[PDB]
Structure formats: structure tokens, C-alpha cells
Design a protein around this ligand. Structure first.
Ligand code: FM6
Ligand code: MN
Ligand code: MN
Lengths: 379, 372
């Protein structure tokens, strides 16, 4: 009855919330593994003391002189923890490149993978899919969690459309001309040595939604031409599924990541009192409007990369990271982020091949960065 | 593959929409029987012509005399059609008291009952429930169709609340004082329309929801949603709500009731999320509209009380239409009648028990009218 949980990336926002859900629900879950990168050693050590969990890994080579009592440490040590720890669920909330090998290891163990790491699907693609059995991957992000719930409304042959909702970001309703000269600070993107500013930039870019469309295709096996994005400023409905008879099923909740986290951990069972429900005793309205795809071409560009397949989505994401970083640094204008991704992709025919190994994904990503760094440089 | 379908009340709105669904899906369904009152004989004869179905029932004896070719005629013609005809699904879209016996006949056959007759469950209560097996009654109403769909979102132990949406009728935001002056014309009256306006329809649907899904009344909520695009929602124990949405079109829940658990391709248009739209929610003004509160009271009391609730409504509704009482007196009289109905919390053993409750309720409502 009690599920054994490995929490990877335990010190970040997703990992800390998952540990609160588990602490609230010791009848349903027990923590059996923790992993974080060496920069987060002090917090990881606090978690060991608080959870009493000693099976912990420092997920990289860093803090190398302070790991004398850590059971796993070094490059790829989170993968080793996953390989060696009996569990029912691996929550992978590692950030970026770190997340890929532990995802692959988790799938090989036969455990459920509660996947928070975007890298795994966006870059890994068919590497990750070929390692998974049907139903083994359960998403942690609000939208994909919404979609997985709404897909319960019918059999696969009855699915007409998947509809992801999007806030539209801070430039919702702006013209191309309006966006020509915006600053990173106008996007709500301010410095911090984390993926925070990148994440907020991707939200302004609509690249966030592009990535979520890619993840949707891979998670649910629905063609790109049947994955739509709708703007919904309230973010109460987190996504919807439209079925062949005309019926749409939607999932709605006040924003709170503990809900989709709880569900991914307990899948298929829901977790009592994980989050607060919508209160239908106070007036509200849920608004929907089309995405302006002329102004925000990032989403259709993600579909184009996705349709090409293989390492093309790794290329899309890696080119975005470089271009977005350039925009953050004040080196390029806002429109050039997606302009650069498009340029890199146009040159990227060699990367439509499926990746044979992790190294092919890494090669595609290095190529894409180099290619994006060139585009940025002149300009 | 082909489900044989008996359509009761074939000439009404639901009936005709159902025939069109069946005609569009001959691989899925076949019409094998029709029943109507006879008021719209033109339609029935036209339906006989288009479907080829000669297996027909007519309530009116003088209207059946008009053709003299109808195998079933009289006050129980529909019931006798159900008893005789080999079917997989009986769609009962008969109106009012006409629907109860046919519902009982249908359940007795073992066929799925696609139920569009509110009276069956609301008045029939446990008598209808005792006649049914798990899953045999499949609701046609948009709200209950939505609920059944949203329940796929989890297991039964995970359900926190069922939330029915209500249009609010044309008198959203009106005071009791405002409602005093309402004419039949303003309330769109047309018994479903009046009930929509008075919120009694929602009251009835709350009772139906309890009896169909076995959720307690204190966990069946109503929210006002004027667009009627969200048709109902379920809130699960983890805080997640699952909602069903579509442009209002009965062909959707009709198709689903006939083909359950399988969906029917192209039954209805989907929401078009490429055009801007707004879905508004607001609480019901329960001071001005207590019909749902009253329905819960009747439901909790149980037995014949919901039969009393519905019959008092119909009498009071008739009085309002006749010009004998004002609009707020409809639900006012329902309350008065229910409050006098302590003796009626007894379980109905037979159809006559239900008819006795309804008689009592009609007479008590009339006495209240003769007061005002
Ligand atoms: O299920 C239905 C219905 C739905 C669509 C079309 C016709 C009837 N009804 O119960 C009719 C009354 C309900 C209703 C439902 C949908 C609409 Cl579009 C309207 Cl006007 C009224 P109510 O919320 O007022 O109680
Ligand atoms: Mn998201
Ligand atoms: Mn209804």
C-alpha cells in the first residue's frame, strides 16, 4: 500500500513540495532516496536530518571535499542511486542535462517515473520513449497533469484534440511592433544564477508553450496537428481534451503545484487534501482567447521541430537557451530569440535522425548552441 | 454492433433529436419502436414513413382511431409496446406521469434505460431504484451526462462534491419583490422553461443526481453559469475539479446515453477555442430562489417526499399560468405543501403509493392556491 519514492532534485521547489506531500501522507508514501547537485549540499544535508533518509546522492562532482559521508557522489551519481534503490516511483525534478540519464535509469527499473524534468522528453525524445512501457511516465507539470486526467474521459480512438491553456505571458495582446524593442526586464526577466529568468522569458516568448506542445506529443502520442494552445489568463483551467463526439473535458484548480505533484506520486490514486479546490460560491469568470500565432510563432515552430523528429527538438531547445541568454544579456532584440531558433533549425537537417545514445543528444545540443552563438554574434 | 432502440415520446424535442442521431449512425443504432401522445400525429406518421417502423404506440384513443393502423393505443399503449418489443435500449422521453409505468416495464426487460423522463426517478424514487440493476439507468439530461463523464476522473471514494451548473433562468439578480410582477410571458411560458426560471428544474436535477450517483445531498452543489457551456463538474478529494463543456446541444448527451460507454463521432459541435469566450460562475441567490434547498429537504426526508415536491410544483405552476397566483408563490406553495407532508416519508411499495402521494400533493397545493 505504501509507495517507495525516490526524489531527484530534492532541494528545488518541486522536490521540497513533494517532500511536504509525503510528510503529510506517511500512510501513502515513504521517501527512500534523495538526490541534489553539490551546490545544494547544505539543504540536502538538512533533508537527510529531517527525513531520516540516509540513502542520498550528490548528483554531480561538486562539493567534492565535503562528501565523505555521502553514499553516492560524482558525475552521474543520481543515476547510480536510481539503479540501485528499490522503489515504486522516481520523481525526477532535476534541472536540465542532469535529468536525462536518471530518467533512463528509472524507466529501466520498471518503476513509475513522475517526470518534472523537461530535458528528458524535449531533448531525449525517443531515447526516453523506447525505454518506457505504456503508462510508466506520469507528468508533474500542471498542464500535462490536467491532460492526463481529462484523457480519462474516453478511449484513445475517441480523442479529437488536446488543448493546452496558456496565460499568454506579459506580452499577451501586443503587436509585433510593440515587441521590437522590449527589454528582458519588461518580460519580467531579471538576473539570478538559476533557470528562473529563463523560465519567465520562455513564458514571455511562448517558447514555454512550444516545449509543452512537444512534451504533450511524446507523453500522449497525439499528432502535432491535434495539439492546440489556447490563451486563458486566469490559469484556472490547466488544460482540456476534446473528444470525437464534441465533448470537452477540462481540469480546473487554483494554482498549486502540490496537486499535480500528489497525483504523479500516487498515480492512479488521488491524494486527499493535496490542494484547495475551486470555490464556486464566489463569482468568477474563465476567459479564453486565441493565441496570436503571427505575433508568437514559437509554438508553431515547436510543432515544426517536433514533426521533423529525432534530435530536432533538442536543437529547438538548445538554440532557445542560447538566444534567450543573449536577449537577457542585452545582445539581441526580443524577436531575434525565435528568429534565431528558426535559423538554427533550417540548418539542422542532420539532426532529424533518432538519437542512438545519450551522446547523440549531447552532440545535437552542442551543435545547436554553437550554431545559435554564431547567429547571435552578428547581429 | 447495432443497438436496437425504442423511442418513447418520439415527437418531442428529445425524441426527434434522437431519431436524427440514429439516422446518422445506422451502424451503431436501429429504431425498433416509437411512442407518442397523438397531439402531433403528423410528426408520428412522418416518422413512421421515414424510419419504416410500424411498431408504434399512441396514447390518444381518438387519434389512434384516426389511422386505425396502430398496434398499440390507449393510456398504457407505450407500456405495452415496451413489454413486447425486443430492444437493447429504451429511450424514455415521455413527459410527466406518462413516463413512470413505461420506465418500470423497460427496467423489467433488462434493457438499458436511456432516461429523459424526470418524473420516473423523482416521483418513482426507490420503487424505480428497486426495479433497476447497477448501471441500467443511463441519464439523458445534459447535467447528468456531464457528471457521468467527469466521474471518469477518479474512483467513487475520490469524489468530494458534485457540482451541477444552472442557467439561473431569466431572473438572475431579481428580488422577491421584483418577481411578484412576473407574467407567464416573462418566464418563457412550456413546463421545462417555467421550471428553469423558477429553479425547480435544478431542484429536480439535484434529486435525480442523488438517486443516480448515490452521493449525499450535502455534497451536491449548484452554481449559476449563464452560458450553460459547462454542463456540470466533479470536485475530487485532492482538490482537482473535472468539468464537461460543449455548446448547448442535446444530441451530445442523447448520443452518449444510447451508445454508453462508447462516444458517437460527430454527435455535436465542440467548443471553438479559436474565438474569444467568457464562462461566468456566480452563486445562486438562495434567499430569492430556495427551490434547490427545498429539493434537498425533500430528498433527505425521502420516501414519497420528492414525488410530493414535484406534484406540488406542477399544481402551483398551473395556478401561476392560469393567473391565479404570482411567480414567487410557485416555490412558496411547494414549501407550504412540503412542510405539511410529514406523513409522506414512507417508502412507496407500488405505483399507487406514488399516485396517492401526488394526489395528496396536488390537493394540498390547490388548498394553498385557494388561500392566496
Ligand atoms: O438539460 C437541460 C437542457 C440543456 C440543453 C438544452 C435543453 C435543455 N435543461 O435542464 C433545461 C434547463 C436547464 C438549462 C440547461 C441549458 C440551457 Cl442552454 C438552458 Cl437555457 C437551460 P437549467 O440550468 O436552467 O435548469
Ligand atoms: Mn507548465
Ligand atoms: Mn438538465
Amino acid at each position: 500500500g505504501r509507495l517507495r519514492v525516490v526524489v531527484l532534485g530534492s532541494t528545488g521547489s518541486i522536490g521540497t513540495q513533494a517532500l511536504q506531500v509525503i510528510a503529510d501522507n506517511p500512510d501513502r508514501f515513504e521517501v527512500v532516496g534523495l538526490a541534489a547537485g553539490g551546490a545544494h549540499l547544505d539543504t540536502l544535508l538538512r533533508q537527510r536530518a529531517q527525513t531520516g533518509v540516509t540513502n542520498i546522492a550528490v548528483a554531480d562532482e561538486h562539493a567534492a571535499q565535503r562528501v565523505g559521508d555521502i553514499p553516492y557522489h560524482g558525475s552521474d551519481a543520481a543515476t547510480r542511486l536510481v539503479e540501485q534503490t528499490e522503489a515504486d516511483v522516481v520523481l525526477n525534478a532535476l534541472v536540465g542535462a542532469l535529468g536525462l540519464r536518471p530518467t533512463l535509469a528509472a524507466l529501466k527499473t520498471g518503476a513509475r517515473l513522475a517526470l518534472a524534468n523537461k530535458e528528458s522528453l524535449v531533448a531525449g525524445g525517443s531515447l526516453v520513449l523506447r525505454a518506457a512501457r505504456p503508462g510508466q511516465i506520469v507528468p508533474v507539470d500542471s498542464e500535462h497533469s490536467a491532460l492526463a486526467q481529462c484523457l480519462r474521459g474516453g478511449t484513445p480512438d475517441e480523442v479529437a484534440k488536446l488543448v493546452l491553456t496558456a496565460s499568454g505571458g506579459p506580452f499577451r495582446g501586443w503587436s509585433a511592433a510593440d515587441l521590437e524593442h522590449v527589454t528582458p526586464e519588461q518580460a519580467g526577466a531579471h538576473p539570478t544564477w538559476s533557470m528562473g529568468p529563463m523560465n519567465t522569458l520562455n513564458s514571455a516568448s511562448l517558447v514555454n508553450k512550444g516545449l509543452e506542445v512537444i512534451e504533450t506529443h511524446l507523453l500522449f502520442g497525439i499528432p502535432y496537428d491535434r495539439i492546440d494552445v489556447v490563451v486563458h489568463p486566469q490559469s484556472i483551467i490547466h488544460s482540456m481534451v476534446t473528444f470525437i463526439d464534441g465533448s470537452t473535458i477540462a481540469q480546473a484548480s487554483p494554482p498549486d503545484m502540490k496537486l499535480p505533484i500528489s497525483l504523479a506520486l500516487g498515480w492512479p490514486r488521488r491524494v486527499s487534501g493535496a490542494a484547495a479546490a475551486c470555490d464556486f460560491h464566489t463569482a468568477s469568470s474563465w476567459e479564453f482567447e486565441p493565441l496570436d500565432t503571427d505575433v508568437f510563432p514559437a509554438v508553431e515552430l515547436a510543432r515544426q521541430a517536433g514533426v521533423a523528429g529525432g534530435c530536432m527538438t533538442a536543437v529547438y531547445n538548445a538554440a532557445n537557451e542560447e538566444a534567450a541568454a543573449a536577449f537577457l544579456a542585452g545582445r539581441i532584440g526580443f524577436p531575434a530569440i525565435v528568429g534565431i531558433i528558426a535559423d538554427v533549425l533550417h540548418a539542422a537537417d542532420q539532426w532529424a535522425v533518432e538519437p542512438a545514445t545519450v551522446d547523440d543528444v549531447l552532440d545535437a545540443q552542442r551543435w545547436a548552441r554553437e550554431r545559435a552563438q554564431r547567429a547571435v554574434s552578428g547581429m
